[PDB]
Each structure stands twice: as structure tokens, then as C-alpha cells.
Paper text:
To understand how the D-alanyl group is delivered to the DltB tetramer, we determined the tetrameric structure of DltB/DltC complex. Each protomer binds a DltC without changing the tetrameric organization. DltC binds to the intracellular side of DltB via hydrophobic interactions (Met36 and Val39 from DltC interact with Met302, Val305, Ile306, and Met309 on the horizontal helix HC on DltB) and salt bridges (Glu40 from DltC interacts with Lys312 on the tip of HC and Arg317 on TMH8 from DltB). It sits on the HC helix at the entrance of the C-tunnel. Ser35 on DltC is approximately 20.4 Å away in straight distance from His336 residue at the active site on DltB. With the Ppant group attached to Ser35, it can insert into the tunnel with an extended conformation that reaches out to about 20 Å. Thus, considering the distance, DltC can bring the D-alanyl group to the active site of DltB directly. However, the tunnel is blocked by Trp285, Met332, and Ser293 in the current structures. Sterically, it is not possible for DltC to deliver the D-alanyl group to the active site of DltB in the resting state. This means a conformational change in DltB is required for DltC to deliver the D-alanyl group to the active site.
Numbering used by the authors:
A (entry chain F), D (entry chain I), F (entry chain H), H (entry chain G): 1 to 79
B (entry chain A): -1 to 415
C (entry chain D), E (entry chain C), G (entry chain B): -3 to 415
């Protein structure tokens, strides 16, 4: 149920990139998140939270850090 | 007499056609800018100025379009609110499709009628190609729930925005409304005015000088030479390719800079439309530079949504095929938006195949770089040779695309029209 | 010796009142000082008199420029009589003397209206806006009768009756309100608000009078009139078209003039009464008359309708109040028709509006009593759905447009019925 | 002479209904008396107080409330 | 290629000084910046000089376009014989030097007034306002002789003498007062009062010169003149009618010009002397000259009458006060008549006003003496009721109108004398 | 030989009416001198003390008081 | 395939620089934002570029609109040969490289001034004001050579050389002074002083160019030229008249343009050097050259005179200093004549003024040494009085006017040719 | 290395005028320097010091006094 635990399980459920230790580092240079792959993770998280997050408002710097996603999902849950 | 002839008798001003149009517009827009300086808006004066300049740009040889224009706006309302009053109840995921289809119906009719029997439909007017986008954006915002409430004043001020009515930069309602409500500061307004004057100057240079040179003094004779020469290809074909492509950029950039300058004089910073496209290293970077407002619109609303809906159903097994089909469909739809002919669709699908092959090259380069790093081999350097080769091949491919989009292959070839 | 004076005051300029757009330039410049003075709580009281005189004389001196002489008589006539009544008010107060003063103070309007009916040609003592000027004078005499007004100087009188913006046919004022709005200069924020409203009214008036008015009157109206006349018969589609187009044209021209007058008065620092406030969305006749030509209808309600009700109820000549109200409505609307011009069609218009108001009052009372009985019976009240409002708006709009058809005078040409 | 006594004795007689318990209620929404019916009272006091209320400028706001009507005679007695 | 320079002068625009009201429009637009700057403590010298020069040359051109050339010489002439007397005054002051300088200063006007009467048509030196310009120069010279004025630059001299609002025929002004008024700019409230005064003067001038003057001079005067000419005889009712009509025409026209000039001067920040302050109501003829053409009459009273009394009395030529006063009055009024122009009727007008003044003085002295005689004898002095004042004003007004008949020159046409 | 006594003697040397007492009083109210009578006294002192007082600017504000003229002429004697 | 863009250039609107009063309305409306922003210590630096470009292109697009292309070359030339020096200056400072850079910078002027003499038709590089723009570029190169100038941005350059008010033929600046005046925005009192002086200059320029210059040039000059041509001979009265009138006309037109340029430059906030300061009261030749065409003469004194005398005295090629001064004067004036244009008469004018300056210097030195000898002997020096000053003024004025006759070129038609 | 003595000794070598004591006195009133004369001094600086003072802006307001000439050469060798 915990959002952080859900993210931790999700990131390694399929790819198994062992990125649990590498969390504070830049994932853009790690080859995990790019200009196109981020949508795959977004639609994956849609399969867990079942929330239709808007994509027109989704900015380039909206989800730069994982903490931004963690706080944003909780922000939209209450509203 | 009272007829369409009465409309045609009205004065006609080409939108950003002569500098005297610009002195008229500056005189008209000085009071609103000065009023906006002290953080107040006139509304009524803005509506009158916008409508008078719209009708002046529309009352040409074929002024009947104005009548059609009216129908169009009414049509949009008849459906836009028809979704708003339906939004509050429940989104069925299918009423949204019907509303979007009915909103784009004027555009699809205007793009189908010329290529079915003999002529364009009546409902066509000047800027319908760049006005359906605002309404579809509004309906998309309704579907996602980002937008909930708005008055008619805001809606019909955003949709019929005068500076970007003819063919100006394509906006979205949320950003435009948030920018229209909040007046900027004083120093920010000074910077906006200085940028507006710079844009007017650069637009003069771009459209009234360079566009004239590349379109009226070089294009006709080169086209005639290529037509007379005939054959599959020739040096005059290359000449017309380069000349037309530069003409198109130097005209569209001029118009976009004019529109941005007028918008800044109205206190709204419309999205930029050109950021030096020809310096593009790869094909993908070209579309973040060439017609960036429209390209971003298609990326946000027609590319991301398509890949999302394909991922939801899990139709395709791998990411690569999904990205490829999304790119191809997006560019094909862009070409269709231009107009349903053979060469516009060819231009769209060619940009699509270029984009997908560029993506494949980027993926291959990343894989080989990873292999080099694993094996300790130095990655391929890019200082002066690789970058120059990339920009050269990208610019040449873009110019070939502009040749196809020019429609000159219609006369050079003799393929059935 | 020879009376060629008429030719002297004919070649001088004929600047139209709110005519060409460039007019608002001239007047605008001519109003730059006064408005500035308003900001400093200083009223010039001489420069404004000069600008008022110049623009009134410019407006009047046209093809019928001889009317200027008539004006120089009419003014004097008022000054001959109004002051007379004030002297009487100092000593005594009787009804018959007041009636005589009212008759002698509104006689010029009676002559202008009644001369063409008998003689057939416009009477001499007629000018551009006499019908909207005897209202101010008879209002001042009315106020003196009730004791609201006791003292005033000729400066206030002649800057009130001859108010430059609302002169030709403009909002009909009253002395008390105008004097109070003239004495107390508004503060800075109020003046800025008035200036922005004045510019809004200027541009709206441009739209109303130069574009919409011309489109509806100089383009569609003549061919529709010709087609309707050619068709003949009692009624036909083209006369219905002329009814609708003329109604809209009349409203647009009148509203454009009213907005121009309000804008200029706001520039001069006075808030003249409004004229039109969304009249066609009116859902009922009683609600129509509070939106169509507000200045005039409110004037007749204050001075000619209410006083009629009071004098009728003083003697109790009617057993029930409803008959008194019906009679008062009919008489008030007949007097309005007479004021518009004593012919067959204006009187028909007045009588028709009076009958309409009486019918609306009867229907209102019937609805009220039906609703009361329904509530006392425990049943739900009458519906107030959007359909009811739509039907009310539609029927009121149709009746108003029929009235404007009668008032247009086109029935005098379509029907060759002179009497 | 008391204006209040005349007012209270005329209110329950001109409408044939005993509504003397309510005096401060707004007749605009009460519906007991219409907007155009106020003249019925204006003539009435003329029979009793022999003073005529001006109607040149008193429109729909000057003497709307009943208490203001009651005190109007006293106010006019000064002048 | 230009032919003669006089043709080039003729082709220039020519605006009649205070003719069409559009002249006032041009003048107001031109003088707006100067008046606006007058609120603060700064004045635009170059702008004032340029506007004065352009309006002067616009007034001076036309059919008589050579006169402007004769203007230039005139200016030099004064500067030749003003600064010469300034240099002489710096050292000494002999009577004969002052006499010669004054004679040479008024020589252009003397020639202009004497050439036509001696076997000629029109002297070259004449221009539009030479009759009202040498007054300022001879005022400078007499001020130097009295020693009141000591120093002044050329800017002040040639700005005071060529004053634009008072060039053609305006309020004759001294130099000390004008210079002191030009040095010190008035306050803000005083400037506002001046602006209101200027607007009121413009309005009254419009009433006085473009309406009443037109009525009394361009519609009634020609028929009366024709009737009197045809009738003939020594005197007739048409002659009386033309007397009254012309006298009123002259007063109204001159008052219109004077009020126009005062309004323009106030707009330029200088209070020029007032010409007319309600004439025709003076009880005695002596009070007439404190009301009719006040600037000129005061000028002659100060510089030509009082100085004559001083020179005659200090030389004890006569024996009694009465004879000295009589001869001074006669010479003063004769000189005024000469200043008008050397004909038979102008001199007749001057000497008649002189006779009226001296007989008025004699009557006043006799009335005082008889009042004292009756007081010391116990008899009541003569009453001063309304009837006495009415008969006095009637006699004075009739005598003035007779003077204006003589000054009109109509007696030259009726009698056919001196021709 | 006394200038102060000469000042008093001047006024009575011409009219011989003994107006020494009426020195500071209103001459207009007394009627002894007026706008024309006082000119003789004004010019009388010129032939004795040799003062050419400017009469060109002589308004009805300079010599309205008898005290002012004495101090003015004494001040301008040496000027 | 045609190169017809030149015709397109002739399709642009035309606007004579300071050629019509309505021009200043456009200029004031365009420059209001610059002045307002300047008031608040704010410079846009982009709106100025836009207005300068618009008005320069408007001025240049006349009948010979093709000159615009030449301008778009000239600028590109100067830049290429200005930075080419600056990049050199940091490294080395050899003299011959500086000479070559200066020659290549001034080459377009050499071509424009020498091609018509040889070829016979105006060279391509010519445009409206090239002769007044090479001065600023050579000034920049001179300043770089001296080390006064250092690194700078292209913005300052191209807003300095192409300065709009002084483009066609206006005051000649220097880079350092203009840059320091552009950077330091003046205070509010200084801005107000500039505005009042600019309005004074605008009005005075109207007077100088549109009235006096037109009168002296389009009215008297052609008839005098025709009469002088018809008379023939070496010299006569009509050519003396044409020399006088042409000298005055040249001075008035030039002063009018200079005052216009100063006014506009003040409106932009830069005080350009003056051009004329009472040149005809010069009284002496050297004092004439410090009053006639101030900017140009000062430029040649700072850069072409002083440098030449310095380099002459470095090598001490002349035994005495007086010969050095004479040679420097002659060479400077000959270079001025060349700059005016290589014909016979311009070079005659230059060498004539050089000889005049040498003669005046010799006379001045002789008078100084005579005065010194007299003081040594104790004798009083020769008087300087009104007559001596008048003699000096008259002889200098006559010599200047003869020089302007030579410079007019009319002597070429009168004396030479066959007509 | 002092420079005042060099200037003092070099002035009289050409001007033939004793300037050892007359240094602070204004040369313009004394007639020693006739405006242009200072040019002959300028080359003297180039005679031995091999430094040339700029003459682009050299007017008769900056280097008018000999003290300015003495002081400016020291600064001109560094800036
Ligand atoms: C020529 C003769 C006929 C002329 C036209 C007659 C018009 C009036 C008759 C039609 C009346 C029906 O019209 C209907 O009237 C009702 C009252 O009953 C209005 O109802 C309204 O009445 C008044 C408005 O002034 C208020 O009490 C209140 O706002 C509402 O009750 C409705 O808004 C309208 O729809």
C-alpha cells in the first residue's frame, strides 16, 4: 500500500536493473529513463494506482526526481 | 445592394503584409499596452480591436468566408459547452470521442472537400487550420479534467485571438488563460516591449526582404527552367529545392515573429515558433526547432496519447514497434492536417520514416557506446567532423522534404492529380 | 430694413451632433480643460458655457438654420415664465395658477406638435430638440409646485435646460439630480471610473450608430419597404421583415445616441440618466418599460402617471383601484403618443401600449390570485421553468415589434388610409 | 395627535386583514401591499394629517419602510 | 522670375485681425503653449517673438501688401530716435532736445495724417496700426524726459512696441506698466482668473462684433444712409436714424475689438488697459471720457492734457484757473480730433467734444457755487432724485450720438461741403 | 527761512483759506480741494523748491495722504 | 536573370530629411518613447535602432533609391576595415599599417570624389551622406592609433557612425565624446533644458530653412544668375549680387539643417557639436574659421592640421616655424577643398582660404611684434575702437563672400564655358 | 627621475626666455606661450623620452598650464 514501497517493487519487478542502491544518482545518464521510456513507467504506475494522470500538463521537469513523483501521487490522491 | 458584394466592398488588409499594416496595428494597440502597464485591462476595447482586424483580414475577394466563420464559431460553442455540461456528470470515454470528432468536423470537411469532387467547402475560411487546434485542445483539457470552469468571454477571447488568428502560433487554453489573467510586472513588461520591437525588426528583414528575394526574384525563373528542362531530376530541381525551402522558412519565421511581437504588445507571450531550425544535428532535434508550436502540439496531444492508448491495451510486445508506429501515425496525421494530396502525405510519411530511422540510429549508437564502455574502448568522439556531417545530412534531408512539400514534384513529374 | 437675417445665419458651419467620427476629436479637445479642472475640484463655469454654446449652435445651424432664431425665442419664453412662477411661489400657492403656468410653459411644444396637423407645415417656433427641452422646464415648474425647489440662479437654469450633450434628443433629466451632481465634483477615483466608462460608451456608440445602425437602416430597410409596398394587401412577409429590421434599427440608433450623450456628459462631469438597459430580453411589458427609453418612461411615471393616480384617488371617482390603474395607464400612454407627434399612428401606438400594459396588469393579478388559491389548497405553485421565461420573452418581443411597426409610420404608406 | 395610532388603525382596515403584529417586515417580499399600491396610504394621511407627501422625486426608495412613513409627518412638522 | 517683391508679398496669406472666428481658433492653438508655460515661472522668448511676427505679417499683407515694407523702415526710424535720446538723457536733458526728439518720433504719423489732406492720395509710410504705435514710442520719449525710465534692452523695447495683440488698433499702453507686468509672472490662481476673464471677453466680443455690430452696421445702416441721401435737406428723420444706428455700430465694433485684444493679451499673460466700461450711462460728459475709449482718453489726459496745464500754469501766462482749464481742454480734444485724421468733420468732432467738456465744467462749477449760496442763505440745495439723473443721462447720450454722427463723416455726404 | 514752517505756509499761501487745521483730514470730504483744485498746490511748490515731480504716471494713489507727500518730497530733494 | 531589385527599391516610400514640417510630427511621435524612457534613466537601445533605420531608409529612398545598396556595402566595408585595425592594435602599433588602414577606410570617399572627374558619371558607391560618414570611421581609426580608444562593441559603432539626426550632412562627432555622452544619461533638469533648447532649434530651423532659405534661393538667386550670365564680362553688378545672395542662402540653409539636426539629437539625448555661431560678425579670418562650419573646421584642426604640423616639426624640415605654419595651413585648406569635390573651383576655394589664413597670420604676428616694440619703447599701442572693428568686420565679410562666390561654381558658368 | 628640471632647461633653449622662476604664473597673460607654441614643446617629449602625447582631444582646456604638462607625462607612460 505504501507508495514508496510500491515504486521500489515496480522499478525492479520487470527490468531487474538492481537500481535500489542507485536512487539519488541521475537516472537520465543511467539509461533507465529517457525522452521516451518515462511514458512506459508512467503507464506502468497507472496499472497500480489506477489514476488517469493528465499528460498535457506533464512537464519536462515535472518528474525529474522520484521524490517529485512520490509527493505528486499523494497530492492528487487526496484531491 | 445588400449581398456578399456589400462584404466585398469592405476594406481588405493582408495580415502582416505591409509595414503600413504595422503602423495601423501599433496605433491601435498602443492604448491597451499602456493600460496593461498599470495592471488593468479594458476587455471591451480588446474585443473591438480584435474583431475589426479579423474582419479586415477576412473581407477580401472572397469575403463569404466571414459568414462561414460565424457558423464555425457557433458550431464550436454548440458542442464545446455540450461537453462542459456533460463533463460534470461522467466521462464515458466515448462521448469524448464524439465531441472531438464533431469539433474537428469543420476542419475535416475543409480538408476533404477540395480532394473529393472539385472545390473547397463553404465553411472554409482563412485560419481554420490554426483554429480547430484551440478547440480540440479545450476538449482534451476537459477530458483529462485539468480544466473545469470558464466563462464565454474567456473562451471566445482565447479561440478568436487576433494576433494568432490567421496562422499564428497554436496555443493551449490553460497556459493562455493563466497568462491573460495575471498581468506581468513593469520591468518584465519593458523586456517584453523591447523583444517585441526586436521581433518586428527581424520580421521585416525575414519576410519583407529575404522572403521577397528568395521567392519573387529567384523562385519563378528557376521553376520555369526546371519545368522546361523536364526529366526525373536536374540541377534546376536542386536550385528550386533550396530556394523554396529558404523562402518558406524566411516567410513563416517572419509571420511568426510578427505574431509574437503583436502578442507581446497585447501582454501575452504566445509560444515561440522558430528557433534556428537549420542547426539541427539530427532529425529529431529538427522537430524541436521547426514549427515548434505545432510540433509540440502534436507531440503532447497526438503522440503521447497514442502511445499511451497503445500501451494500455498492450497491443505491441516491444517498446520499439510502439514508438515507431506512434511516430509514423503522428507524422502522417500532420501531413493530413496540411491537406489531403499526394505530396503532403508523402512529406508527412517521409518525415515519419526519417524520425523512426533516426531513433533506430540513436538506439544503435547507444548500444555500441555501451559495448565500448564495457570493453574499455573509447566512445566515438564528436568535435568537428561527425557534427558537421550530421548537420549537413539533416539539412539536406529537410530540404528534400521541403521540395516534396512544395508540390513542385506535381509539375516536374506528371503523376495523376 | 429688409429681413435677410435668415441668410446671414445659414452659411456658418453645420457640424452634426455626433455625426462624423472626427467630431469626437473636436469636442474631445474642447473638453480637455473642463475635465482637467474636475480633477482639481475646480469648475470653470464660463469655459463650459462657451463650449456648450458653440456646439449647440454648430448642431442647429443646418439646412433649416432659421431654427436658431426660434431657439433664441424659446429660451426667452421659458425665462419669461419659470421665474414668474417662482415669484408666485414666494407669495401664494394655488392649483389653478400652477396649471396655467404649466400650460403656458409647455405651449411651444403644443404648437410644434399641432401645427402640421392643421396648417400642414412645420411651425416657426420649432428647432432640433424642443420636444426634449420643455421636459426640463415643466419639470422645474413641477418641482417648484411641490416645494422641493425654492431658489436658484439663472446660471444653473440655463446650464441645466440647455445642457449640451443631452440636447438634440437625449436623456431627460430633472433639476434636483442634475444640480446635486453638478455641485459636488467627484473625487479622483470616481473621475477615472467616469472616464473609462465614457471611452467605453464612445466606442460602443461608434459600433451602434456607424456600423449596426447603417447596416440595418440604409441597407435592408429601403428594399424591404419597397417590396412590402409593392406586394400590397393587409399583411405579408416583407412588411414583417420591415417591422423587425426597423425595430432593431431604431433601437440601435437610439442607443448609439444615448451612449454618445452619456459619454460626453461623463467627460463634462455629470452622470446623465441611462436610456436603454437590455430592452429586448424583457419578459413582460411592465418589465419592458423599465428597460426601453428609461429616461422618458421614468419621467412620465414620476410626473404624469403618479400624479394622475394621486388626483384620481383623491376624489375617489372609481370604486376599485384596478379601474383607476387602468385609466391612469391608458391616459399616460396616450399622452406619450401625443408627445411623439399628434397623427393617427402615434396615437395608435400610445393606445396600443396602454392596452397592453392594462392586459399585463390583469394577467399579473390573475396569476397572483391563482397562485394564492393553489398554495392555500396545498398544491404546488405555477411553474417557473426556462420554457415559461422563453415564451414570455418571445411574446413580449413580438408585441413590442408590432408596436414599433405601428410607430414606424409604415402603416401609413402600406395602407392608404389617411384618416 | 399620534401618527402611530392612525397608522396602526389604518393598516388593519385598508387591507381588511389584521397584520398589526408585523410592522418591521419588508413589504417588498411580504406581498401584503404592492409597489403601486402605496399611493392608497399617501392619500389616506391627506385625509387625516392634511399634509401631502411630494412625489416629484420620492421614487421606490425614499419612504419605503413603514417606520419612515410614520416619522415623515414628524420630520415635515419642523419644516 | 518673381517680378516685383510686392507681388510676392501680396501672394502671402492675409488674415484679417479678429475677423472670422477661425482666426480665433488659429490664435488659441498658437498661444496655448505660452499660456500653459505661464503657470510656472518660465516664458518662451523665441516662441513669443515668432508668433507675434507671424500674426503681424499675416495681418499686414493683402491688397495693401506694400505697407509691411513701410513698417520695417518705421521700426528703424524709432530705433534711430529713441536710443539717440537715451544716450542724450544719460548725460543731460534740455527742453529743446526733448522737443526735437518727440517731433521726430511722431513724424511718421504726422506725415501719414497730413499727406492725404494736401493734394495727395496716401502716404507710403502708412501701415495698419501706425495710429496706435507712435503712441508707445512717444510714451518712451516722454518717460525719458521725466526721468522715470533709465535703462532697457532692445528686446524689451521691440517687444513692447510691436505687441501683437495690440498692434492693429488696440489699447494704447505705457511702457513702465507694461515692462513691470512683463517682468513678474502672476500667480496660479490669478492666472486662472485671467483665463476665465479671457474666455468671457471672447464670448462678449463674439456677441458684440460678429452679431450686434453686424445687425447695426451691415443690415440697418446702408438703407438708412440711402434714405437720408435721397431725402436730402439740412436734417431729417433718416439722418437721426443713421446717427443712432452708426453710433451703436461704432461702439459695438470697437468694444468687440477691444475685448478680443484684452482676451488675447490675458492669454499671453499681460493685462492691457481696458477700453470700454459701460459707456452711454455717464451722467455728465466728463464721465463719458472715463468710460469711452479709456486707454486713449487716459493717455491724452496724462501726457497731453496734464502736461499742457503744467506748462501753461508754470509760465503764469493766464490769470485764473478756469481759463487755463478751458484752453487745455480745447487743445487736448482738438489734438485728439487731429489724431483721428485731418478733415473737416474729425476736427469738428474734436472741437465739439472740447466745447461739451468746457461747458460741462462751467455748469458743474456754477452748480457748486449756487449750492453753496443757497446753503449759506438757508435754501435747500437742488434735488438729486431719479428724474435729474435720467435727464442728465439722456442729454449726455444724445450729445454723444450727435458727436458720433459728426465723426461718422456722413455730414460730409449730406452737406456736400469741403469737397 | 524755516522749511518746516514753509511746508505749512505753502498750503495757505495760495487759497488763503486757513486750512492748517484740516491737514490730515479727508480733503475730499471737506471739499476744499479736489482732483483739479489740488493741482494748483502741487504745481505751486515746483516754482519755489525746484522739484520736477513726474506727473506722467500721477495716479489717484500717490498724494491721497498729506503726510506721505512731505516725506516723499523731502526724500527726493537730495535724490 | 534580370537583377531588377533596384526597381523594387524605388517602390519604397520617400521622405525628405527635414524637408517638410509634417516630417517633424512623425519624428516627434516616433521619438516620444525614447525621450520618455530617457527621463527615467532608461535606454532601449533597440527601439532607437529601429527608428534610426526607418528614418535613414526613408531619407535615402528618393529618385536615386539605388544608393541604398551602396550604403549596405559601405557599412560592410567600414566594419571589415575597422576591426582589422583593432585586432592589429593590440599586437603591434606600426605607423605604415595605420596609414594603410586609414587609406582603405577613406577609399570610398576618394572614389566618389574622383570618379566623376575622370569617368564623368557619379560612381556607384555614392549615397546621400558618404562625405559626412567617412569622417567618423577615420576618427575611430585615429583614436585607435593614439591609444585613446580600446575594446568596444559593434552596437556602439553602428549606432555611432549611422547616427540618424546627423546622417545626411550634419555635425561631425568624434567617437569618444559621443560614447561618453551616450552612456551618461543626463538629469531631469538637464533633460528639460535639452527639450526647451530643442523646441527653440525646431522653430528657428523652420524660420531658417522654410522661409529665409527659400526666399534667398528660389526667388532672388535664379534671376541674378541669369542677369549675370547675360551681362558677360569678367565681373559686373549682377554677379556681385548673386555672390552676396548665394552666400546668405548657403549659410541659412546650412544653419537650418544644423539646427534641425541638433534639435533631433537633443531629443535622443545626445548634444552634437554646433555648426554655426554668428559667422558674419567674424571680424577676422581665423575668428571666421572658429565660427563657420564649426564641426568640420574643428575636425580638420584636430586631426589633419595638428597631426601634419606635428609631423612636420618632428623632422624639422623647415628652418623657421612661420613657414611650417603657412605650409600646414595651405595643405589643410587644400585637403578641405578636395573633400568638397575635385573640380577647379573647389580647389580654388581651398587654396584661396589657405592663402587668406596665411596672410592673416602674418598680419597678426606683425601687429603683435609692433605692439611689443611700442611697449618696449613705452609708446601706446595702436587703438582698437569701433571704427577699427567695423573695418575688420567689413573686410573679412567681403573676403568670405568672394570665397563663397568661388565655391559656388557660378564663376565657372559666368567666366568660363561659351555662354 | 625628476622631469621638471628637464622642461625648465629645455624651454629656454628655444624660446630664449627665462622661465626658472616664472613657473606658476599664467603663461597666457605673460605671452610666453601663444596657444600653438606648445606644439614645439610636444616634440621635445619625443626628442628624448620617445613618447607621443595624444593630440586627438588636445584642446586649450586640459594641458593649458605647465603643471598639467609635467604631471600628465608620468601617467601617459602607464595607461
Ligand atoms: C396587445 C395586448 C397584449 C400585449 C402583451 C401582453 C404581455 C403580457 C401577457 C403575457 C404574459 C405572460 O408572460 C409571463 O408573464 C408572467 C407573469 O404572469 C411573467 O412573470 C413575471 O412577472 C413579473 C415581471 O414583471 C414578476 O412578478 C416576476 O418576475 C415574474 O412573475 C413571465 O416572465 C412571463 O412569461
Amino acid at each position: 500500500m505504501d507508495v514508496k514501497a510500491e515504486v521500489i517493487e515496480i522499478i525492479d519487478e520487470l527490468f531487474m536493473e538492481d537500481v535500489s542502491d542507485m536512487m539519488d544518482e541521475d537516472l537520465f545518464d543511467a539509461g533507465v529513463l529517457d525522452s521516451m521510456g518515462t511514458v512506459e513507467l508512467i503507464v506502468e504506475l497507472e496499472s497500480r494506482f489506477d489514476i488517469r494522470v493528465p499528460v498535457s500538463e506533464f512537464g519536462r521537469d515535472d518528474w525529474n526526481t522520484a521524490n517529485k513523483i512520490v509527493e505528486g501521487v499523494t497530492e492528487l490522491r487526496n484531491a | 445592394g445588400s449581398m456578399i458584394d456589400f462584404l466585398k466592398q469592405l476594406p481588405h488588409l493582408e495580415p502582416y503584409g505591409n509595414p503600413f499594416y504595422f503602423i495601423y496595428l501599433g496605433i491601435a494597440l498602443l492604448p491597451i499596452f499602456i493600460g496593461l502597464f498599470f495592471k488593468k485591462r479594458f476587455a471591451i476595447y480588446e474585443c473591438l480591436v480584435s474583431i475589426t482586424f479579423i474582419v479586415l483580414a477576412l473581407t477580401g475577394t472572397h469575403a463569404s468566408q466571414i459568414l462561414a466563420l460565424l457558423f464555425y464559431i457557433v458550431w464550436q460553442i454548440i458542442w464545446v459547452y455540450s461537453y462542459k455540461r456533460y463533463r460534470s456528470q461522467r466521462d464515458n470515454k466515448w462521448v469524448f470521442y464524439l465531441h472531438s470528432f464533431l469539433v474537428v468536423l469543420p476542419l475535416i470537411l475543409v480538408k476533404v472537400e477540395p480532394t473529393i469532387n472539385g472545390t473547397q467547402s463553404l465553411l472554409n475560411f482563412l485560419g481554420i487550420s490554426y483554429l480547430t487546434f484551440r478547440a480540440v485542445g479545450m476538449i482534451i483539457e476537459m477530458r483529462d479534467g485539468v480544466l473545469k470552469e470558464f466563462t464565454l468571454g474567456e473562451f471566445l477571447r482565447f479561440m478568436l485571438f487576433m494576433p494568432t488568428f490567421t496562422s499564428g502560433p497554436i496555443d493551449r487554453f490553460k497556459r493562455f488563460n493563466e497568462d491573460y489573467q495575471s498581468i506581468p510586472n513593469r520591468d518584465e513588461l519593458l523586456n517584453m516591449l523591447e523583444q517585441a520591437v526586436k521581433y518586428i525588426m527581424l520580421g521585416f528583414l525575414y519576410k519583407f526582404v529575404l522572403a521577397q528575394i528568395f521567392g519573387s526574384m529567384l523562385l519563378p525563373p528557376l521553376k520555369a527552367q526546371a519545368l522546361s528542362q523536364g526529366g526525373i531530376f536536374n540541377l534546376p530541381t536542386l536550385g528550386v529545392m533550396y530556394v523554396y525551402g529558404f523562402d518558406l522558412f524566411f516567410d513563416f519565421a517572419g509571420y511568426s515573429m510578427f505574431a509574437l511581437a503583436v502578442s507581446n504588445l497585447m501582454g501575452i507571450k504566445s509560444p515561440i515558433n522558430f528557433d534556428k531550425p537549420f542547426i539541427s544535428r539530427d532529425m529529431k532535434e529538427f522537430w524541436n526547432r521547426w514549427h515548434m508550436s505545432l510540433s509540440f502540439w502534436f507531440r503532447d496531444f497526438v503522440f503521447m496519447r497514442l502511445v499511451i492508448v497503445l500501451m494500455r491495451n498492450k497491443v505491441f510486445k516491444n517498446r520499439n514497434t510502439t514508438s515507431n508506429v506512434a511516430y509514423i501515425i503522428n507524422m502522417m496525421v500532420m501531413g493530413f492536417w496540411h491537406g489531403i494530396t499526394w505530396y503532403y502525405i508523402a512529406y508527412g510519411i517521409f518525415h515519419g520514416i526519417g524520425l523512426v530511422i533516426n531513433d533506430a540510429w540513436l538506439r544503435k549508437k547507444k548500444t555500441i557506446n555501451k559495448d565500448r564502455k564495457k570493453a574499455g574502448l573509447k566512445p566515438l568522439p564528436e568535435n568537428k567532423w561527425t557534427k558537421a556531417l550530421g548537420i549537413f545530412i539533416t539539412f539536406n534531408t529537410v530540404m528534400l522534404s521541403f521540395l516534396i512539400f512544395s508540390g513542385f514534384l506535381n509539375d516536374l513529374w506528371f503523376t495523376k492529380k
